[PDB]
């Protein structure tokens, strides 16, 4: 059993996971990432406000029993969930080919 | 119809999305994020190697027809997929409460 990732704590754009519980859901327990700071944590450990922590969104397939309280075989649905956070700036940067492909 | 996020291009840990296609999959077209650089792009637009771009992993529910080539009603499965990348360092940083809750 491998140790669950600590990226949420070591990221320059750290996040906390919030539990979402509903009986009309599969999985019933869903973990949503909420960015810790508006800014990003620089190399020195300080918050820089010329950078922003933004949540990465993903469309997840969840099972919904129609009519309610009837689990067997039906049709599922899609829901947007925040998986983690990334650090952005207002600039689209361009960097050489030798730094690429990793 | 809202413009799909450009975080993959403005992130300090940028990524590219690779298409995964299989007839025994729902959704059949899956987008996997692959980190562009080993390092992270600093504020100046340069690659810093005392930081690392790491992919954020998420467990997605995918439909698998058993026996193959029979779509109607059966039992689905879980698969780990890379959604995007984040910037990490070897240090777990600690920052004051007024910079928190955002």
């Amino acid at each position, epitope marked *: 059993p491998k140790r669950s990732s600590d990226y949420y704590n070591r990221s320059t754009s750290p996040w906390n996971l919030h539990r979402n519980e509903d009986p009309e859901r599969y999985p019933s327990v869903i973990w949503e990432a909420k960015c810790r700071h508006l800014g990003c944590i620089n190399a020195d450990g300080n918050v820089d406000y010329h950078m922003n922590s933004v949540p990465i969104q993903q469309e997840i397939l969840v099972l919904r029993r129609e009519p309610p309280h009837c689990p067997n075989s039906f049709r599922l649905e899609k829901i947007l969930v925040s998986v983690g956070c990334t650090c952005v700036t*207002p600039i*689209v940067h361009h960097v050489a080919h030798h730094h690429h492909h990793h | 119809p809202k413009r799909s996020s450009d975080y993959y291009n403005r992130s300090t840990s940028p990524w590219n999305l690779h298409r995964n296609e299989d007839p025994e999959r729902y959704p059949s077209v899956i987008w996997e994020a692959k980190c562009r650089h080993l390092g992270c792009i600093n504020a100046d637009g340069n690659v810093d190697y005392h930081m690392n771009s790491v992919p954020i992993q998420q467990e997605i529910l995918v439909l698998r027809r058993e026996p193959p080539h029979c779509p109607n009603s059966f039992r689905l499965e879980k698969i780990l997929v890379s959604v995007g990348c984040t910037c990490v360092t070897p240090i777990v940083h600690h920052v004051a409460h*007024h910079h928190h809750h955002h």
Partner: antibody
Amino acid sequence: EVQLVESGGGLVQPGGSLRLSCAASGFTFSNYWMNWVRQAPGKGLEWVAAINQDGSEKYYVGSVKGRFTISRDNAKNSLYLQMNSLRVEDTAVYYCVRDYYDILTDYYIHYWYFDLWGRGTLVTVSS
Amino acid sequence: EIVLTQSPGTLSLSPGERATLSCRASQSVSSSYLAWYQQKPGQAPRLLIYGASSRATGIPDRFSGSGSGTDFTLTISRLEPEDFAVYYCQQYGSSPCTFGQGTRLEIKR
């Protein structure tokens, strides 16, 4: 025909608050990132704060951390700067500015430079 | 933070003369993302150049820019009375965006 008009400036004592407004006209306001740029009397230009199209991202200069808040109302074509705990060194003319952007294929590319400026509003912080 | 140093502080030339304005960055500016602004007294700045060498809309041919990395230049091939103002360079290749302290271009008589 395109214009940015700032208002809200005036005299305020140190430790005081002031809200600046910028009215945008002649263009699709929601298509652009906007910034506040200031200039102390007889001095140079200085970046204050940036905001993206839908206000999901807000950026600030080091000196205004926790004191200033940038916001926008796309339906009212307005930009705002809430200035709290004002300091004497905040005394300046504040400019509302529009950022240049490009659309390559179906991708929006923001560039952090200003193709349109307002006339500015004088903010005096003094006792 | 990239620090932009402009030279000279004041430039005294007559209409008809060529003007050379310098902007030196403390560190290399990504993708030559350097802009120039003209500001006349009591007025807001006005964009002249972007991307080190490209003219903004409505800017006449006498204005030209060049340079890369850390060294950039603004040239006015033949000065007209209307060109006497303060000029600021601004970089947008590094976050945060920063400006030079300006060069004032005054009429030599």
